[PDB]
Each structure stands twice: as C-alpha cells, then as structure tokens.
Amino acid sequence: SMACYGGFDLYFILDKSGSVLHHWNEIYYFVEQLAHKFISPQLRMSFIVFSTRGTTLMKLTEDREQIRQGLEELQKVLPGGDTYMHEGFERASEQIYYENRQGYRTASVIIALTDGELHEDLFFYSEREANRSRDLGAIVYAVGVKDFNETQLARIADSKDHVFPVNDGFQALQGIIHSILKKSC
Amino acid sequence: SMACYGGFDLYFILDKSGSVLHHWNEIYYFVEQLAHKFISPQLRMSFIVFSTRGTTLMKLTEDREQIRQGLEELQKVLPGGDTYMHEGFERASEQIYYENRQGYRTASVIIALTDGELHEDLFFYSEREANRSRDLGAIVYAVGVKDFNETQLARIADSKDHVFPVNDGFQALQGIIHSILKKSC
Amino acid sequence: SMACYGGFDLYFILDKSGSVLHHWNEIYYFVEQLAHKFISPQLRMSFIVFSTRGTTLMKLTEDREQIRQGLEELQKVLPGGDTYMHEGFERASEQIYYENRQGYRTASVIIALTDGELHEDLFFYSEREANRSRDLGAIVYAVGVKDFNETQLARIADSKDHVFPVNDGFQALQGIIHSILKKSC
Amino acid sequence: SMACYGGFDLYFILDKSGSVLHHWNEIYYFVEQLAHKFISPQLRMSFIVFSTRGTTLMKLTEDREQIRQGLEELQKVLPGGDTYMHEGFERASEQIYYENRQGYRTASVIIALTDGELHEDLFFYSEREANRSRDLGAIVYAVGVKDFNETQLARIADSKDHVFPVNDGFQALQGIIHSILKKSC
Amino acid sequence: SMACYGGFDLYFILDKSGSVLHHWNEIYYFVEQLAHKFISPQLRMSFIVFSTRGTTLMKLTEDREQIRQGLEELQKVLPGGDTYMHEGFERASEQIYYENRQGYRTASVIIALTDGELHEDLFFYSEREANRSRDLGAIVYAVGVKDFNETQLARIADSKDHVFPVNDGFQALQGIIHSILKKSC
Amino acid sequence: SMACYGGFDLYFILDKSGSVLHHWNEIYYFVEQLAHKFISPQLRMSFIVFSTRGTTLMKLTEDREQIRQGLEELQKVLPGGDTYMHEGFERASEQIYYENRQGYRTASVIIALTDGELHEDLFFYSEREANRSRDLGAIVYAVGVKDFNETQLARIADSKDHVFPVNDGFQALQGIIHSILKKSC
Ligand SMILES: [Mg+2]
Ligand SMILES: [Mg+2]
Ligand SMILES: [Mg+2]
Ligand SMILES: [Mg+2]
Ligand SMILES: [Mg+2]
Ligand SMILES: [Mg+2]
C-alpha cells in the first residue's frame, strides 16, 4: 500500500565461508558503502555473518557508533568454514519476529551476499528459511559474487528481479534504500 | 504477513439515505451488537454516516465512553436524503491517511452498510473512493440490506467474499474481528 | 477495469444429450426466465445446443423477434445423443472471435447448462475449449443439472464461484446480468 | 495444469486433544466414511493424530488392509492432552518430502480436522508448518468441529474456500476427492 | 486477452518544470521522433504538459496536421515552475474517461517523461492519480531523464519493467507501439 | 513448489523458414552449444523444426547417440517456406500430453528460436498453441534472431522475462538449465 513506513530495518546476511575468501573485501565494501551513504537514524541495520554457523555480529540498531564498531568488526572477518546460509536467515527471522511484536509498519529488508555455492541440502534449508523470513514480513534480496547462478539465488530472493551481481546490486539497492527512506513516516 | 497488528481500526460507513428508512434499525443493531461484543481498547472504531453528504459522526477511538456516546447518537439517526456513499469513504480515507503517518502496522477495516441503491455516477465515485481507501491500506467489507445486488457491492468491497447480507453479516464479521484481535501484538 | 462495456454478449451453451432427457424443461425455463426478464437490446444473446455435435441454434442477436423464435425452437428440443460439450464452446468461441474483430469492449459471458456427465476425453476437450473461450475474452459460468460434481464443473467455469446449481441459478445469474447491464456505456 | 496426477496422497491430520473429548466420534466418522467411500489403490492415505505431540498412526499407504487396521486404531483413540497441531503438520511434511524425492506428479492433499482452539503461540507454529506443507506441494483443507472460527482455520487451510464444517464437509470433500481421482493418470 | 484493439490512444505526459531545464530538448525529441515514426491514423495521441499546473496542449487525435501543429507548440515550450505531475495524469484520466464512454476496446497507454524529482506530497498525489489512470484502463510507462530513481518511478508506472531511461525507452516503446499497432482490429 | 523434478524435458522449436535463410547456423549453434554443455541423461530433449509445416526431427530422448544423430540432421537443415510456428508448438504439445500420462513431475521447457516475423493469423495461431502448451504444463521461452520484436515474442513466451536475444540467450538459458538439473530428484 501507499502507507508510509514507521520503521526501516535492514538485515545484511553475509557469506564468510571459505569459498568467498577472495571476495570478502568486495562484500565488506558493499556493506560499508551503503552504511556510509545512509547515516540517518530512520534506517536501522543488523550485520549477520554465516559460514559453518550463522551469528548476529551486530543486532539491529540505529546507533552509528555501534554501526561503526560493527563495520570495524566486519573488516577483520577471516573467511573460512562451510556455507550454512539458512542459519543466517534464522538470525534475521529471530530479530524480525521480535520487532514484529512492537507493532510498527516496517520495511524489513534482507540483503544476502553470497557466491551461491551451496550444497544441495544447504540450498533446501536456505530456501525454507528465506520463505520463513517472507512469512514474517521480510523482502529478500540476494546479491551474488563470483560465479553465482541467478536462477538459484532467485529461489532465495523474492524473485529474479531481487537478484543482482555485486556491482550492479550496489547501485540498484542504493536507489531502493533511498526510495524506502523517502517513504518513511 | 504473519506479523501481528499493532493497531486494529474499524471504520463503519453507514447508509442513512431515504431508501434505508425501513432498514435503519437493522443497520444500527448490526453496529451496536459488534461494539458491545468487542469492548477491548485494542479495537478502535469510527462511525461515519452518509446520505446527501458524508460525515464522521464519531472519529476513530478506543475510548468506550466516546463509543457509548457515538452509539447513542447513531440510534437517533433519521434516514433521509440522497446516497453519496463516496463521501463516506472520503471520511474514512482522511482518517486512515492521518493514522498511517503514525507508522503502526494496522488492520484498517471498513464495513460499509447499504442497500446498494446508488445512481450510476454515484456508484462510479464510490468505486473510485473505495479503491483509494484500499490504496491507503484498507480492507473493505460491504454488508447489504434490502434487495441489494451482490455483484454491484463486490465492486465496492474487496471481493465477492467481502460482501455479506445483513442477517448473516454479524456472525461472519464477529468471527473476522475476533481473529484480527487474536492477531494483535 | 472501471471502463463501461460497449457491448454485452450472452452465450447459452445448452446440454441436450441423452442423459438430460427429462431435465430439458428445467434447462429451457432457466433460459426463458432470463431472456424474458432482460428484454433490453443492450443485451445480445446466442443459443447453442450440444449433444453428439454442437450447433448454433440462434446466432448472437439483439433482435427480440429472433430471440422469440429461438426460444420457440428451444422449447421443442428433443434430447438425445452423446455429450460433446467442447463443440458447444467451439460454437461460442467462433462467434466471440468474430465479434472481437469489431473492436468493442464487450462483456462476453458464457452460461453452460449441463449435468457434467462427460467421459474422460470429452471432459479434457471441454476444458481445453473453455480455456480457449477465456483467451478470447469470455467469462464462463456453469449451471449444474441433476447430481452434478461442483469441482468438475469448476474446471469448465472460471472458478468454483462461477458454478451454480440449476435451482439457485436464476437468482444468482439475474443479479450478475443486472450488474453488467448497469455497467453498460 | 491440465496434466493428470501420477499419484494421489491424502493426509488426515486428526485433533485428539482434550478439547475434542465429546467430538472424536465426528472426527473419526468423517475419516471412516471417506476411506471406505474411496477404496481404489489409486488413492493413498495417511492417518496422523495430534494432541500433546504429533504422531503418524498410519504411514501413507494404498494398502486397504493397512487402512482397515489404521481405522480400527482410530476407533480406540482417547482424547486428551494439549493441541500441538504444528506437530501434526510436521508428520505430514516429513512424508511429503520423502514422496517428493520419488519424482511423481502427485495431488498431495492435507485434511486437518480440529476445533481450532489453539493457544496463540501454538497457532503461530501451526500456520508456519501449514505454510511449509504448501511449500512442499500440499493443498491444505481444514474441517472444523464444534463452533470453530472459520477465519482462524483459513490461516491454516489454503483459503476460506478450503474450510468446511464437519457435519457437511464429507459431502464437499467426497466431491473434491472424486474429481482428483478422475484427474488421475 | 487475445482480442484485438479497436483503438490505440497514446497519452504523452511531459515534465516542463524548472528541474528539466537542461533536458526539455531530450524530452521533445523523444516525442517528435515517436510521432514521426508512427503516422498511421490507427494511432491517436495527446500531448499533455505539466509544471505548476497540468494542461492538455493537444487533445487526443488521429489527425496528423493537428499533431504537426502540436509538435510545433511543444518545440517552443520553456521549462519552469513546480512539478505537479498528478495534474498531468488528471488531464489524461479525464480524456480516458470520455473515451471509455464510447465503448471501444482500446489500448490506452501513458508515457510520462520526467526526472521524478517530486516533493513528498506531490509524489503521493502523483501515485494516487496514476492508480486512477490504471483503474480507467490505462497502462502507464515512465521514461526518466537525469539520474532518476527507478524504484520511485516504478510507483508511477505499472511496474519497474515499465520504467526506462531515454535511449533504451525510445527503442523499447517503438517496439511496444509497433506491437500494439499489429494488434489493431 | 520446492518439490524436485522427476523429469526434465526440453523441447527446441526451431524456425527454418525462408526469412531465416542466412541465419540457420546461428540457430543450430545455439542448440548445439546447449546440447554439448548438458550431457546428463537427466536431461531429455526433442528437436522440432518448422516452416511451412511443423515436424518432430527428433522425439524426446535422453539418449546421447540419438541426440548426436539429431544434431547431425539439424546441421544439414536447409531453410525455406512459410512460418507456421503454431505447428511447431503442436509437435511439442503432442509429446507433452503423452509424457503427462506417465504421471511424473517434470520440468517441461520449450525454447522457441525464431525471428518472430509471423503474419497476423499465424501469430494468432501461435499464441493459441503456446497457451495450449502452458495448459499442459510447459514453460515457454523465446530466443529471437534478426531484428525481432520482444513485445511480440512475449505473447508466445510466458512473459517478457522469458524472451531473450540470440546473443544473450545462451548465458541465460544455460543458467536456467543448470538450476533445473540441480533441482532434479
Ligand atoms: Mg561457501
Ligand atoms: Mg439510498
Ligand atoms: Mg450427457
Ligand atoms: Mg484442543
Ligand atoms: Mg521538476
Ligand atoms: Mg519466417
């Protein structure tokens, strides 16, 4: 609807698995640059990392000092481990569920950065948990690095229109985030 | 979305035109029964009347004393005048717009009570304004009295499934309202 | 769309197969009731019969004298033969295609009267041809005679909401036709 | 799709909680009536019960002797315990997932029999698990016992059109199952 | 629908506000080149300009002499004033409404050329009026000048797929126009 | 659905009409490229050619020796004749219908290679038969050669997103085919 958003919650779900070793710097830069472009307290963001497990590195916050510290932490991430992306979505869903209980109309947006190199069962669990996120009200974007398959990530994201490569995705999502911020109450 | 509702705002849009002279008691008691069944401050309601013009008899409120006074004023309504239903929707939309700016996730539900006897241009304006209410985030129900045409009221309401006869309307909408209240945060 | 209809074309597709032998009066009088209720030249109608083959008994017309003669011919129908309903839809679609070439915005409505007792391949062909009618712009209703299967007829009609028992058929369809006629330009 | 079904898998999810103590006969009889109405090996069925926990009483089978034994086990059920309906759906989803891996085009139909008296968190889990069933290809019907709330059950079922009262739900589902069996390869 | 179009009405809604000062040449050239590429009387067009107010510079017409004169007038347009785009859509909708009353099946297409630099309330009114145009049967395209926000223009146009930059948009729209003309009755 | 595919059936519908006389090597190379990249018996393919008539050059098969011989025959194709694409779809639908009767959950994908230069009535027949393919469960992609109109091919394909130019077709469809093979049971 045309109803404004009382909240804007941005959840970064970040692949730090072994396979993205040579792409972590561009994953980090993507996140850092969106953060530095949108410094308004109207936008809250969370940093979630995943490899062998999914962990909330920084819980959802409007506080730019906490965001600064979270980004410093992200810059120091050492890629390694498996690619259990579904746990990244679990970390988002847990937070979205809690936020829902506050009763605000929120643009709950997920940006998942990954190379899409997920083993069969892991992809299945990821699609399941992404659907779970959507059930809680989330809009899911997937930004692919390296040799990601767009159709594969389109099962994680809301649609194929919600899937971008890293460089194109940065420009596209900057516009989307701007639009959502203009649509804030 | 499975996200709970931070608000539940019920807008009664009530036909008080000349054509409903023998049916006002049915309309009033429909409203009175619902108001008396759901006394929780979690439910806010507004009473809008329309004939020659559309007027907000009681602005959206959770206050049961205000609601009591509103019901007492509704009881004394004397049907008469034309059927400018679109103005009834205008009164609802104006309030919905204002409430939107607060940024809460709200079940904004319209219940329009009418015989559906709208002249051609008046029907056109009504559908336009009902669409406008939907754009603001409203769910429109139509409850028909007299010999109402279900297909006609289906263009005002969200769908044919949002159209009920007056004698069956209470039981179905009591259920709907109960369900929404159980989905309150 | 809120745009008015430049035309209203009503296509009766009528089962005259062996299985409805003693139910023909029920079928005919449903048709006659509607025809005599709606005498406006704004409504054009065609009468199509089917059993072993499908045949246009009366081509689409606004002319009430032609409609009178068509009705007289329908009265005298002698049921018998197979149930090749798909040919009945073929007769409607051929006319719909022709009318389409005139370029008017038309409510093209099919009402199919049948017991739905179609053998497997015949049902397949019927669903195919009903879909083809929809592709040409038709809205398909099915009115069930005898102990019909609602879900089966829902494959032919637009949805389960477009299926009615013959006993309740008139009341529902007369309302629908009245609404479409009010939506005429 | 007009494509026939290579399989037809019917999953009964049966409430045996304390709240249905006086209504188990209605629940059992619904299942018994359907099972013995459709004795074709083309229809496979599973009986799942739930109260404090969800348990597969009879795994999906076409074998009528197993079905007989399953029904005799249902005759012995003593209602009691909580209403953890989500676990009933879990038992269904586990079987559907396994069946999916066989690669057949199957009509996977769930019929959940319940009074809908679920506490808030339990209802949340149930809607979540029902959605998960739908993700795996299931069509969910809910058949209501006692004075159930159809809007609430519509959150579990596919839609309000997939919700039926128990005392006139055998007639509705019998027709639906007949139709699905006629759409079998 | 596969039905051919009895008419093809193309509405250019053209931003002549102060913010498009360096881009009017681009906007005019886009219109001029499309008009010159499609001279068939089967295509009718209207030129609407907007800044502080929205005005119909040339009402819908098939007459190429009137179009020639309209283009001459458009060429002399001097950018300046506010950006009340909603009025441009009001000018289109008024014409669409009148044309609807004729009862022809028409491809009513809007092309809005703008930088999308609308202040908050103006954007709200614009989205409201674009929705109204859609309700009347219009398909809305947005062609952006400058570094426009695609997501923002996607609120005006039917979808993000209906949003184009100037060069891609020209090629895309001449293909769309060619296709619609091939679909003429 | 998240349910894996029991089968993956790929139907190439290839334009060999006079209008593509100097472009056959483009069309052939596209097919040869895809065949050679995907040699898994999990993928079955059919080669259909059309000009004046539509003919199945190679019936649906997983046999790579038959595929090898099929490609050899495709290489030798000599363009000429009319563009009766609808017959190409008829050859695909015939096979899809047969395979449906086996009752496996199959990804039935059509890739139509054409310049889209179809005369009015031929385009009508093509849209009709493509719709029929979809009704049987097919997903339709169109890959355009020469100066094709994307909007026109979008009427044959499922959507505009299912239409690709021949120079961008391989990358997109390779990714799609890979994804479907990964989603095999
Ligand atoms: Mg990895
Ligand atoms: Mg009145
Ligand atoms: Mg018969
Ligand atoms: Mg219980
Ligand atoms: Mg401006
Ligand atoms: Mg050709």
Q: Specify whether the CB–CB gap between E103 and C185 falls below 8 A.
A: yes
- Closest chain C residue to D3 measured between Cα atoms? C124
Say how far apart CA E130 and CA E136 lie, in whole Å. Answer: 10
What residues contact A2, with CB distance under 8 A and at least 6 apart?
B135, B136, B137, E124, E127, E128
**How remote is the CA of residue E148 from the centroid of ligand 5, in Å?**
12
Q: Specify whether the CB–CB gap between F5 and F180 falls below 8 A.
A: yes
In sequence order, what are the beta bridge partners of B49?
B14, B55
Residue indicated by tokens 């009889």: D29
Of the candidates A73, D156, B155, the one whose C-alpha atom is nearest the C-alpha of residue C176 is: B155
| A/F touch flag: 3 or more CB pairs below 8 Å | yes
* Residue C72 touches chain D, beta carbons under 8 Å: no
Q: Specify whether the CB–CB gap between F106 and F7 falls below 8 A.
A: yes
Amino acid occupying residue D161: D
Q: Specify whether the CB–CB gap between D99 and D152 falls below 8 A.
A: no
Handedness of CA D122, D125, D128, D134 (dihedral sign): negative
CB-CB under 8 Å, F106 with D1: no
Say how far apart CA F9 and CA D6 lie, in whole Å. Answer: 17
**How remote is the CA of residue F115 from the centroid of ligand 6, in Å?**
7
Q: Specify whether the CB–CB gap between B128 and C2 falls below 8 A.
A: yes
Say how far apart CA F29 and CA F74 lie, in whole Å. Answer: 10
- The pair of structure tokens assigned to A169 is 């995705």
Say how far apart CA D20 and CA D26 lie, in whole Å. Answer: 10
- Total domain count, chain D: 1
DSSP D130: H
Say how far apart CA E144 and CA E154 lie, in whole Å. Answer: 10
- The pair of structure tokens assigned to C88 is 């009945």
**How remote is the CA of residue D60 from the centroid of ligand 2, in Å?**
58
What residues contact D11, with CB distance under 8 A and at least 6 apart?
D45, D46, D48, D60, D92, D95, D96, D108, D109, D110, D111, D138
CB-CB under 8 Å, A175 with E120: no
Burial B151-167 (b: 16+ CB within 10 A, else e): bbbbbbbbeeebbbebe
Gap from F16 CA to chain D (nearest CA, Å):
30
Angle between helices D120-135 and D85-100 (to 10 degrees): 10
What residues contact A162, with CB distance under 8 A and at least 6 apart?
A139, A140, A141, A142, A154
Say how far apart CA E173 and CA E8 lie, in whole Å. Answer: 14
Burial B18-30 (b: 16+ CB within 10 A, else e): ebbeebbebbbeb
Gap from D125 CA to chain A (nearest CA, Å):
11
Between positions 103 and 122 of C, the ones with CB within 8 A of D are 120
Amino acid occupying residue F100: N
- What three-state secondary structure class fits F7? strand
Of the candidates D28, D23, D83, the one whose C-alpha atom is nearest the C-alpha of residue D52 is: D83
Gap from F36 CA to chain C (nearest CA, Å):
37
Q: Euclidean distance between the first and final Cα of chain D, in Å?
A: 13
Q: Specify whether the CB–CB gap between C15 and C111 falls below 8 A.
A: no
- The pair of structure tokens assigned to D105 is 């085009």
Say how far apart CA F152 and CA F155 lie, in whole Å. Answer: 6
- The pair of structure tokens assigned to A27 is 């994953």
Q: Is D116 exposed, middle or buried (0-12, 13-18, 19+ CB in 10 A)?
A: buried
Count other C-beta atoms under 10 Å from residue B134's C-beta.
20
Strand positions, DSSP E, A53-119? 54-61, 106-114
Q: Is B87 exposed, middle or buried (0-12, 13-18, 19+ CB in 10 A)?
A: buried
**How remote is the CA of residue B120 from the centroid of ligand 2, in Å?**
12
Instruction: Give Cα C51 distance to the centre of its chain.
Output: 14
**CA separation, residue F27 to residues A73, B88, E110, F127 (Å):** 52, 62, 37, 21
* Residue E135 touches chain F, beta carbons under 8 Å: no
- What three-state secondary structure class fits A38? coil
Measured torsion, CA atoms of residues C115, C120, C124, C125, in degrees rounded to the nearest 10: -80
Gap from C28 CA to chain F (nearest CA, Å):
33
Amino acid occupying residue E44: R
* Cβ–Cβ pairs < 8 A, chains B and C: 17
Q: Which positions of A make up the binding site for a divalent metal cation? A: 17, 19, 83
Ligand nearest to the CA of A52: 1
Say how far apart CA A5 and CA B9 lie, in whole Å. Answer: 17
Say how far apart CA A29 and CA A35 lie, in whole Å. Answer: 10
Quote the domain boundaries for residue A89.
Answer: 1-185
* Residue E160 touches chain A, beta carbons under 8 Å: yes
Residue ranges near ligand 4 (ion) with Cβ within 5 Å: D 17, 19, 83, 117
Say how far apart CA D100 and CA A111 lie, in whole Å. Answer: 30
CB-CB under 8 Å, C136 with E104: no
Say how far apart CA F54 and CA E173 lie, in whole Å. Answer: 32
Count other C-beta atoms under 10 Å from residue E43's C-beta.
21
CB-CB under 8 Å, A1 with B137: yes
* Residue F135 touches chain C, beta carbons under 8 Å: yes
Of the candidates E130, E113, E157, E126, the one whose C-alpha atom is nearest the C-alpha of residue E23 is: E113
Say how far apart CA A75 and CA E58 lie, in whole Å. Answer: 59
Q: Specify whether the CB–CB gap between C31 and C128 falls below 8 A.
A: no
Say how far apart CA E115 and CA E126 lie, in whole Å. Answer: 13
C116: left (phi over 0), alpha (psi -120 to 50) or beta: left
Count other C-beta atoms under 10 Å from residue D159's C-beta.
10
- Beta-sheet pairing, C106-114 with E54-61: unpaired
Instruction: Give Cα A142 distance to the centre of its chain.
Output: 8
Q: Which residues of E touch C135 (CB under 8 A)?
A: 1-2
Of the candidates C56, D103, D30, E136, the one whose C-alpha atom is nearest the C-alpha of residue F102 is: D103
**How remote is the CA of residue A22 from the centroid of ligand 1, in Å?**
11
- DSSP state letters, chain B: --PPBSEEEEEEEEE-SGGGTTTHHHHHHHHHHHHHH---TTEEEEEEEESSSEEEEEEEE--HHHHHHHHHHHHT----S---HHHHHHHHHHHHHHHHTT-B-EEEEEEEEE-----HHHHHHHHHHHHHHHHTT-EEEEEE-TT--HHHHTTTSSSGGGEEEHHHHHHHHHHHHHHHHHTB-
- DSSP state letters, E137-180: T-EEEEEE-SS--HHHHTTTSSSGGGEEEHHHHHHHHHHHHHHH
* Residue F176 touches chain A, beta carbons under 8 Å: yes
What residues contact B169, with CB distance under 8 A and at least 6 apart?
B30, B143
Q: What angle (nearest 5°) sits at the alpha carbon of residue F165, between those of residues F160 and F171?
A: 100
Q: Which residues of E touch B135 (CB under 8 A)?
A: 128, 131
Say how far apart CA C85 and CA C129 lie, in whole Å. Answer: 9
Q: Which chains lie within 8 Å of chain A at 3 or more CB pairs, if any? A: B, D, E, F
Measured torsion, CA atoms of residues F175, F176, F181, F185, in degrees rounded to the nearest 10: 140
- What three-state secondary structure class fits A14? strand
Sheet with B7-15: strands ordered across: B54-61, B43-50, B7-15, B106-114, B139-144, B163-165
- Closest chain B residue to D148 measured between Cα atoms? B175
Q: Specify whether the CB–CB gap between C15 and C85 falls below 8 A.
A: yes
Experimental method: X-ray
- What three-state secondary structure class fits A99? helix
Q: Specify whether the CB–CB gap between A163 and A153 falls below 8 A.
A: yes
* Residue C158 touches chain D, beta carbons under 8 Å: no
Say how far apart CA B162 and CA B150 lie, in whole Å. Answer: 10
Phi first, then psi, for residue D148 (nearest 5°) are -70, 160
- SS3 letters across chain C: CCCCECEEEEEEEEECCHHHHHHHHHHHHHHHHHHHHCCCCCEEEEEEEECCCEEEEEEEECCHHHHHHHHHHHHCCCCCCCCCHHHHHHHHHHHHHHHHCCCECEEEEEEEEECCCCCHHHHHHHHHHHHHHHHCCEEEEEEECCCCCHHHHCCCCCCHHHEEEHHHHHHHHHHHHHHHHHCEC
- What three-state secondary structure class fits A167? helix
Strand positions, DSSP E, A16-150? 43-50, 54-61, 106-114, 139-144
| F/B touch flag: 3 or more CB pairs below 8 Å | no
Among candidates A6, A135, A136 on the partner chain, residue whose Cβ is nearest the Cβ of B102: A6
Resolution of the PDB structure in angstroms: 1.8
Say how far apart CA D15 and CA D185 lie, in whole Å. Answer: 33
Q: Specify whether the CB–CB gap between D9 and D109 falls below 8 A.
A: yes
Q: Specify whether the CB–CB gap between B50 and B57 falls below 8 A.
A: no
- DSSP state letters, F88-135: HHHHHHHHHHHHHTTTB-EEEEEEEEE-----HHHHHHHHHHHHHHHH
What residues contact F161, with CB distance under 8 A and at least 6 apart?
A160
- Closest chain D residue to B2 measured between Cα atoms? D124
* Residue D4 touches chain C, beta carbons under 8 Å: no
**CA separation, residue C113 to residues A124, C27, E13 (Å):** 47, 7, 49
Say how far apart CA F104 and CA D185 lie, in whole Å. Answer: 10
CB-CB under 8 Å, F128 with C131: no
Say how far apart CA F16 and CA F54 lie, in whole Å. Answer: 10
CB-CB under 8 Å, D131 with A135: yes
Of the candidates B61, B132, B60, the one whose C-alpha atom is nearest the C-alpha of residue B90 is: B132
* Residue A2 touches chain B, beta carbons under 8 Å: yes
CB-CB under 8 Å, F127 with E175: no
Ligand nearest to the CA of B19: 2
Q: Is B32 exposed, middle or buried (0-12, 13-18, 19+ CB in 10 A)?
A: middle
Residue ranges near ligand 3 (ion) with Cβ within 5 Å: C 17, 19, 83, 117
Q: Specify whether the CB–CB gap between C110 and C133 falls below 8 A.
A: yes
Among candidates E2, E101, E136 on the partner chain, residue whose Cβ is nearest the Cβ of C136: E2
* Residue B175 touches chain D, beta carbons under 8 Å: yes
Say how far apart CA E59 and CA D47 lie, in whole Å. Answer: 68
Of the candidates F68, F82, A15, E137, the one whose C-alpha atom is nearest the C-alpha of residue C105 is: E137
Gap from D152 CA to chain F (nearest CA, Å):
24
Q: Which residues of F touch C131 (CB under 8 A)?
A: 131, 135
* Residue A131 touches chain D, beta carbons under 8 Å: yes
Residue C17 marked as a ligand binder: yes
Say how far apart CA E180 and CA E5 lie, in whole Å. Answer: 8
- The pair of structure tokens assigned to F161 is 């997103």
Question: F65-71 long-range CB contacts below 8 Å, 24 or more apart?
Answer: F67/F35, F71/F31, F71/F32, F71/F35, F71/F47
Ligand nearest to the CA of E117: 5
* Residue E22 touches chain F, beta carbons under 8 Å: no
Count other C-beta atoms under 10 Å from residue D56's C-beta.
18
Q: Is E102 exposed, middle or buried (0-12, 13-18, 19+ CB in 10 A)?
A: middle
Among candidates E161, E178, E182 on the partner chain, residue whose Cβ is nearest the Cβ of F160: E161
Of the candidates A129, A144, A149, the one whose C-alpha atom is nearest the C-alpha of residue A86 is: A129
Say how far apart CA D132 and CA A99 lie, in whole Å. Answer: 22
- The pair of structure tokens assigned to D13 is 């999810």
Instruction: Give Cα E110 distance to the centre of its chain.
Output: 4
Q: Which residues of A touch E158 (CB under 8 A)?
A: none
Q: Specify whether the CB–CB gap between F5 and F107 falls below 8 A.
A: yes
**How remote is the CA of residue D17 from the centroid of ligand 4, in Å?**
4
Indicate which of D96, D129, D131, D136 best probes the interface with A, i.e. most A CBs within 10 Å of its own CB: D131
- The pair of structure tokens assigned to F159 is 């959507």
Question: Which domain CATH number covers A132?
Answer: 3.40.50.410
CB-CB under 8 Å, C127 with D179: no
